[PDB]
Amino acid sequence: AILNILEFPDPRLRTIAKPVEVVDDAVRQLIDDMFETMYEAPGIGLAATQVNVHKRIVVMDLSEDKSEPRVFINPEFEPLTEDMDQYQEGCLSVPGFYENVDRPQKVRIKALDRDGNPFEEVAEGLLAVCIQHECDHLNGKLFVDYLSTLKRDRIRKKLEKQHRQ
Ligand SMILES: CCCCC[C@H](CC(=O)NO)C(=O)N[C@H](C(=O)N1CCC[C@H]1CO)C(C)C
Ligand SMILES: [Zn+2]
Structure with missing residues (x-):
């Protein structure tokens, strides 16, 4: 099923996701619904909070053809270097707006795959930015919280206008 994606300034998007203790069927179903919604969007990633399910579950596919489905559950990453990188990021929950966000170049991701098995990895390029944007x-x-107050408000208003109109 394609899921509904909440948008700024929906206060629900401020909820702190709770850890996935077990990976049952209900969880995998959600994962699939999350992938579909993401492809349908289209986006290269999606976290459960964006669709009103507040569990620590991140979905991703950083490829052209839909051949690289990646699942990140109970993720967490660490900057392995003091290095930074500027990237013009957009978001399905802040549609239409794209701002150059500054984030660490090399991070070490740590999660649980679709089955819930721990795995560790070292991210650079688009994956680093993406897991950070998802966590x-x-x-x-x-x-938009890395943006100025006036710039962010100029955004909050536009959407609040677009939304109900
Ligand atoms: C870290 C990069 C962005 C994270 C993923 C987001 C999707 C999202 O809202 N995730 O929570 C996305 O697909 N963003 C797209 C985006 O910013 N892209 C697509 C890849 C390149 C970059 C724009 O230059 C826009 C077009 C919807
Ligand atoms: Zn996003």
């Missing part, structure tokens, strides 16, 4: 969703953050 923010689980904590209630949006790339």
